[model samples]
Target: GSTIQPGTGYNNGYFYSYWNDGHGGVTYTNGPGGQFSVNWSNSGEFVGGKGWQPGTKNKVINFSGSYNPNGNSYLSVYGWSRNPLIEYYIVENFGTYNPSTGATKLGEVTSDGSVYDIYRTQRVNQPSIIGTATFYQYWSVRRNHRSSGSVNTANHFNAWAQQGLTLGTMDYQIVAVQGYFSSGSASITVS
Candidate 1:
């Protein structure tokens, strides 16, 4: 159990957020040459866990990794805001999105050569996924259900701003990259 220090080397093991319960021992460990890997058991989905604390107003970020999904899983980026209450996300799914879950597709965009399909759900006046706010999700999902190699993803706040999505002054960002369900394993060498 350790806190993530950006720009430093991480010890090989489970990476848990400030308020997490180890994700049923699901772990992202550092291998030789600073590479990271994860092997997760089927645990809680909406568990009491995960994040990159002290989110940002701009919500700009860069994440890269390789994934071979055995089941449903994702590399998720969350945007949170208080006062007025709003949360946004950019989810990179190695699988497909299920329409029965209540997510609505807005459109699509190409950024840094990565094609993403935008989806949204209003959590305001309803039970929010994280807290209490309207939620917007931008999903850069692979239709082929697999990656050739390393998957590079970039999320710029301005990208969503073009779609009428903006961040608040006190808003912040977080990352929940993992594999769920079955005895599946996923690896992501964060760069």
Candidate 2:
């Protein structure tokens, strides 16, 4: 792994704020070029292990390799919190100052768990996936009932070659080893 591009915490010379949702989920970033904001800020969704993965909670989601394509697949991930509050994860309610303006906030979730409800942001930023060495003290999210706030989840635990390619619809099969979500075949294309 050392031969790969050795990454630093700073992406495009920018720093970030990570939050923990108590359900063992860390922030996962998604965007265009560089400068990804926080969850509920940049892209609302985050990812984490479905189950029984020691420190795979809301820590961080990283894709290894420069490109996620097979044969030429290369997506690398790395992350860690610079602040103790983030490290301690004593709080929740994590987001940026104003993803629209680059402001950030570090606090706890509201009693209702209702976020700002403004998915009014574009997917821009480099390395939308930051390549961090140590993966913890930050974020980890997934497309599960919990991560999705207990909504109708999809095949989050399966291992299909391509996303939504095989399981075009109604073909979910495969159970999780321990506490992970069930794997299956079913993918929905965005309209």
Candidate 3:
């Protein structure tokens, strides 16, 4: 079962959830609003994990949160996987660590009463000690942030996969507020 306990539980960049998957960050604190606050400094990466398993079913991610950025930062809700290496960002901010893309807009989507601009990118494939895996990242970002909302990531993936986008199994998922070359923090209430 998923449990909630907090206070900087993750340090050294990677913390595994009770589900036993990896998220990069430090400190998870339980606070008011029945939410978990994630805090990090000098590190800009992901912060939550959702076990190792291929995504065979679609899931609607709905939640509420607040982000406080320091200098250059972003709060991203994303998914990652290995063995064909695919990553999907349901949403993120456009600032310090924003990703770049050569591909044009796949299209636009509206979820939870928000419009997201979608971008696609194919990264260089890195060969493992044993084999090679493909890497691709699909980005969907809203121009503004809401205190709460829902992201239909599965639908986005399906829209692209229909056109033969290279995406892999779901190894882990992330709901992180990243500080790009700086420090930042965020809190999600009852994700």
Candidate 4:
């Protein structure tokens, strides 16, 4: 096992990223294939995952994982985009708080035997893939939480576009575990 560094890079042909904002006690390890595990305690904010860079826009992302979160956290298909500069999350499971509390409710899409409520939020002068910048965040929060499943990303993309929330050139995409002012552990595999 090896600790994941705070940044982005390639691990055995897969892209991996780890980031923390302020508070510490975060550690992650990468496994063979597209597998990784993360644990964090009293973390201000942290996120880690493994997947593909220059992410495919319409590819169906298949993933399986175990998520155990204490406090506010999420297990998601997370990534970024350019041109339009967007940060997106297709939240599969979350702990404590719902991620869509303050966002603009766009609509909903049914995919992979579940319905996801769509939302759009703006991050002004916040940290982004391109340093500190303002960007829009597109969210697809699943109505029913589950740890492992196939995420039909194309359906979510189309749903977002229909709601006037267009995306741009894809960046890195991963089955991510994220925590904020919380503690959590997750093991994820993308296949």
Which regions of candidate 2 are displaced past 4 Å?
1-4, 9-11, 15-33, 36-108, 111-191
Best by lDDT: 4
Select the stronger candidate by TM-score from 1 and 4. Answer: 4
**Candidate 4 residues 1-191, lDDT tens each?**
34767888888778999888857777888888888998887778888998889788788888887999999999999999998899999999999999999778999999998999999999999988889999999999999899899998999999999999999999999989999898878888886
lDDT of each: 0.45, 0.20, 0.55, 0.89
lDDT leaderboard ranking: 4, 3, 1, 2
User: What tens digits encode model 2's per-residue C-alpha lDDT throughout 13-120?
Assistant: 233223232343123342232323221111222222111112222222221111111111101122222221121111111121212233222221221133221111
TM-score of model number 1? 0.58
Instruction: Judge candidate 1 at residue 58 and give its lDDT.
Output: 39
TM-score for each candidate, following the candidate numbering: 0.58, 0.17, 0.66, 0.96
Tens digits of per-residue lDDT for model 1, 20-107: 2345645444454324455556643421112234555433344445655455655555445554455555555544334215666656
Query: Per-residue error at 119 for model 3, in Å?
Result: 1.3
2 against 4, candidate with superior lDDT: 4
Pairs clashing within candidate 4: none
Root-mean-square deviation (CA) per prediction: 6.1, 19.8, 6.6, 1.3
